Design a binder for this molecule. Sequence first.
Ligand SMILES: CCN1C[C@H](C)n2c(c(O)c3c(=O)n(Cc4ccc(F)c(Cl)c4)nc(C(=O)NC)c32)C1=O
Ligand SMILES: CCN1C[C@H](C)n2c(c(O)c3c(=O)n(Cc4ccc(F)c(Cl)c4)nc(C(=O)NC)c32)C1=O
Ligand SMILES: [Mg+2]
Ligand SMILES: [Mg+2]
Ligand SMILES: [Mg+2]
Ligand SMILES: [Mg+2]
Ligand SMILES: [Mg+2]
Ligand SMILES: [Mg+2]
Ligand SMILES: [N+]
Ligand SMILES: [N+]
Ligand SMILES: [Zn+2]
Ligand SMILES: [Zn+2]
Lengths: 180, 180, 368, 368
Amino acid sequence: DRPQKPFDKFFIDYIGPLPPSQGYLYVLVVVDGMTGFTWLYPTKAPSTSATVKSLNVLTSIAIPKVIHSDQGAAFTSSTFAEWAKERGIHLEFSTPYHGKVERKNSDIKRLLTKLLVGRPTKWYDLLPVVQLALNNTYSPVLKYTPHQLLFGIDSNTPFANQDTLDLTREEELSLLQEIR
Amino acid sequence: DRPQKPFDKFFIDYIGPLPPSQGYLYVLVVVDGMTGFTWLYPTKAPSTSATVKSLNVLTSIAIPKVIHSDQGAAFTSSTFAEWAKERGIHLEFSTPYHGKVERKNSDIKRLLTKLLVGRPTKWYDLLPVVQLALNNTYSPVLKYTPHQLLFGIDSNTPFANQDTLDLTREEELSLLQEIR
Amino acid sequence: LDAELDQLLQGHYIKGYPKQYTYFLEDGKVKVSRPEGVKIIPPQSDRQKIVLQAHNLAHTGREATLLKIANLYWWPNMRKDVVKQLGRCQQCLITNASNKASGPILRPDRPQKPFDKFFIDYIGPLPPSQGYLYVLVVVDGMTGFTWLYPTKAPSTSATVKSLNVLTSIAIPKVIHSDQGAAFTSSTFAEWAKERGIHLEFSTPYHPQSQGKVERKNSDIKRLLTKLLVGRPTKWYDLLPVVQLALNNTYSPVLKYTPHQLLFGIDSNTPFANQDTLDLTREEELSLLQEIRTSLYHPSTPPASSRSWSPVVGQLVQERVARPASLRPRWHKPSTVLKVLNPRTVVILDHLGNNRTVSIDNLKPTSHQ
Amino acid sequence: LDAELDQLLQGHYIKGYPKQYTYFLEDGKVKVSRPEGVKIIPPQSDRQKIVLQAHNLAHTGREATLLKIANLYWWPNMRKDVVKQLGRCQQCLITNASNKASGPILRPDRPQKPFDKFFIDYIGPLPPSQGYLYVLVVVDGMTGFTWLYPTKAPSTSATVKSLNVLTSIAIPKVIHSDQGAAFTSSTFAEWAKERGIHLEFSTPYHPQSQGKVERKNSDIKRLLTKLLVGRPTKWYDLLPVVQLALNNTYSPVLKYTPHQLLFGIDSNTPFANQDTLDLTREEELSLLQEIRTSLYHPSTPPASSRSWSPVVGQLVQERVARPASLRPRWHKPSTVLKVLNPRTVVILDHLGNNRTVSIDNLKPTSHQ
DNA sequence: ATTGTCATGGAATTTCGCA
DNA sequence: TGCGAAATTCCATGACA
DNA sequence: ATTGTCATGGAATTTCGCA
DNA sequence: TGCGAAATTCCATGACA
Ligand SMILES: CCN1C[C@H](C)n2c(c(O)c3c(=O)n(Cc4ccc(F)c(Cl)c4)nc(C(=O)NC)c32)C1=O
Ligand SMILES: CCN1C[C@H](C)n2c(c(O)c3c(=O)n(Cc4ccc(F)c(Cl)c4)nc(C(=O)NC)c32)C1=O
Ligand SMILES: [Mg+2]
Ligand SMILES: [Mg+2]
Ligand SMILES: [Mg+2]
Ligand SMILES: [Mg+2]
Ligand SMILES: [Mg+2]
Ligand SMILES: [Mg+2]
Ligand SMILES: [N+]
Ligand SMILES: [N+]
Ligand SMILES: [Zn+2]
Ligand SMILES: [Zn+2]
């Protein structure tokens, strides 16, 4: 067996609906398995079409050997399958209804949730800093950040301020207000 | 004493009024003394102004040391004198009321007169061929044509057909008709 | 094909496949253990499609194509198959740049006499002056003596008006021009024939061929520029001044002014030369003929190390003259019919017309 | 003056006037019998006006001026007086061409790491596609890896939108550009500062300084051209294709694709390289660091035989950037303050501002 | 069927003036 | 028959849409 | 205050395959 | 230990408004 590598497997998934930001409602999350690198793309819908536009941008930078998703409608569509086949990408689905990637995905949700309070509407502008944070975050399991693993160098934006990521009593109270 | 040279003396004079050709009535005749070369310029008037426009063209090609004319109004004007002085040309007038040049001038009149019958109105167009004829005409006194003397070479248009230059009985009769 | 790779697997020798490596079967594909690693030997009838796929990724040339292919495959003489494709890629052949220089320029003999050859050309559009926009520039080949005429348009009609005035002085044997509309019109051709003047044209889009007049245009603009510094650009009134100034300026290499070469004596202009004041005109004209034959003549320079030379029957490509955005800079290949001289050729274009053309507007089609 | 020429006439010796010739008076003018003929010796206080009159005929340089003067006059050291005037003719100094080449180009060190330096530049306008007219091109200096963004305008606003997307991946230390309006706006400068990116600008009108990106623009247009042959020029949809194609193309001199230099491993693209399939990522990243430090570096070429080099305090002239018709191609003289390196200088212009400038846009003012 | 050219000013080389 | 300096010649550089 | 670059295909040079 | 031919390297040429 060969050691795991960048571009071996991209894990994709949707987050939303979110409070509309610049007419966008979802975030397509793309995470490289081996490095834990994250790419985020805002969409208007979890449709095959929006997935296809967004991945088209990413795969003009790097192409994964395999994409892995749950059985979301967008990903199980025959259009998406033709798309992947064109590009020589094998598609992989987890079975319906059931740690590196999973911890990453959890951080993304938790980090968004933290920043879309007091400003549930300005997230579109924040996506680039969200990614830089995610990608320059120390990995407990491996010595390195994802940036380090993907490029083989130190980054120019190190996030030394590993934050709380937890909601304070103010944020807690007025996140309960936003849905009341 | 130095041998005579091109540009030593230009002999200038007017011919006209002529039958209007393209709104022109006169011909300014310029003849180099030494070579017998001829330059012709059509004017609307024997005025200092038309003389000045025309010579301005010629003296942008060569400048004579001396211009010689009769005491025509155009040539004795103080404007024309200022013009000549600017250019460092000495002006020379024959006295009022009285052979190389003279024979040349005579040919010009005789040659025009010959060609402005049957077509007293198309002379403007003819000026260039008139000059080529004059300038590539054998000189009895010297071995050479004026072209030869001015440029030191044979010309590409030799006028082997030295013509009659005299009026036939037809031309004679219908030159008498034109002024009747 | 699959025939040849059967022989190879059992241990036979085939020409081109070095016997000293281990050739095996794996996943239904023939492989070989090469110093760089294991590579697949595709069947011969597969090889074209592989080279094409590699080339088409970015339309790469020989080595960039080879390096992709060599990532997965080995066979005998890969670059031969690489080159064979590159020479058949229409897009590559008409888009890529040349990388071979033309041969060294010719230096034609100076015309022997004033009026043997005139070179003529337009300058402009310049800024409007007295409602004129262009200059007609006429340069006698032997002397350098130059006539200047302002025009509103680089038109035959204006050219004819102008030359009618100049030819009053003398008729030239030949007039040489570039292929601008004014000079190639039949109205012009008639005018020339009327007077037994022969028209000679440059190869298209090659102003060097008219080098004498083109080089005079530079001096004309240079003097006009100096004279106009800090004033509005009203040049019309200055044309005659420039004409006279230049015709009476010395060429340091020749030690003569165009005027001197034309007339053999200065006219009444500043700093006129007095050296022949005591000779007769006849003696002066005699010394002039001597000066005219003994002028400096430059010799053709050394060839660059990677110049090419046209051979009859060779595939060559004309440079596109006014390439639009994102369009190839070279026409389709064509064939050298005649080699008029080492810098000029006649080509049959594919259409197929005969085109007389400058080697500088050709490149030799790569990969035969 | 008239004092000195009195001494000379009676037969004394004066410095510079060779004693061995016969100096006489005639028409109230001092003359001398020179091998070429009799020439007038103007008084010293006459000599300037004479040189000026000669020069002004056609604004001629040294020898063409001298040859006119020598037609009538002789004095001692004429060319010294000739040169003295030429160096004071404002029109000549700002119109004439240079005839000295710049020193040989520098080859700066490759940036050491991806994201150390970005070079960026606009291409266009191209023909409209999907209502876009330009490309923003970003090229990482170490890898050659390139990002392409279509824009409707070469504007800051579009540049900021584009870099906001790219900087999602990584923030670069420095971004290098030319002085186009989009990159020199303060809106841009703020954007850069916000993120601790340092802006670096080329000397004006010197695209060589950005050679990496400029050279990528060529490949971008070349591939777009090949792909569009015989179709309408709808390029917008092809931009991502071109991006991926180029980033995965081998440089034959380097033997690596920009992608390889950036990632150390090919992604799932045709003919991907398999050589590190058995190394761990850690081993792969280690070998990548080795490759990155040992890439070919070109060395500065030999100097041309007539190059010049800027010295502090020297008079030099900036090239005019967009000279109008019949206007000089050079600005007024100015002074070299600092020599940043043999190809870049700071000049004090006469106004007098400090201008950082490329030696290629300078000529050294002639005749001191 | 046609084809580079030549002003320019430092540097290199030759000539001059004098002995 | 040789020196220093002035004159002349050499020639790369660049621009003619 | 900043700085040329590099794909390309014949030609030149080195290496390979075999003895 | 040297041959012929294939591979690889060299590098001038040209184009990036
Ligand atoms: C339309 C017919 N026509 C064709 C082309 C347009 N053309 C015409 C011209 O007069 C010139 C011209 O003067 N120069 C300037 C130039 C450049 C380099 C040199 F070496 C030299 Cl001796 C001169 N260039 C071109 C040209 O070919 N540009 C691409 C040109 C012409 O009239
Ligand atoms: C307005 C700010 N601005 C200034 C100038 C206009 N500029 C800008 C560019 O991007 C380029 C450009 O790409 N090229 C092409 C070129 C030519 C020769 C070379 F060696 C390389 Cl490396 C590139 N030329 C110019 C230019 O200076 N033309 C005279 C240019 C720019 O944006
Ligand atoms: Mg999901
Ligand atoms: Mg009279
Ligand atoms: Mg033309
Ligand atoms: Mg032209
Ligand atoms: Mg630019
Ligand atoms: Mg550019
Ligand atoms: N010739
Ligand atoms: N450097
Ligand atoms: Zn191709
Ligand atoms: Zn001047």
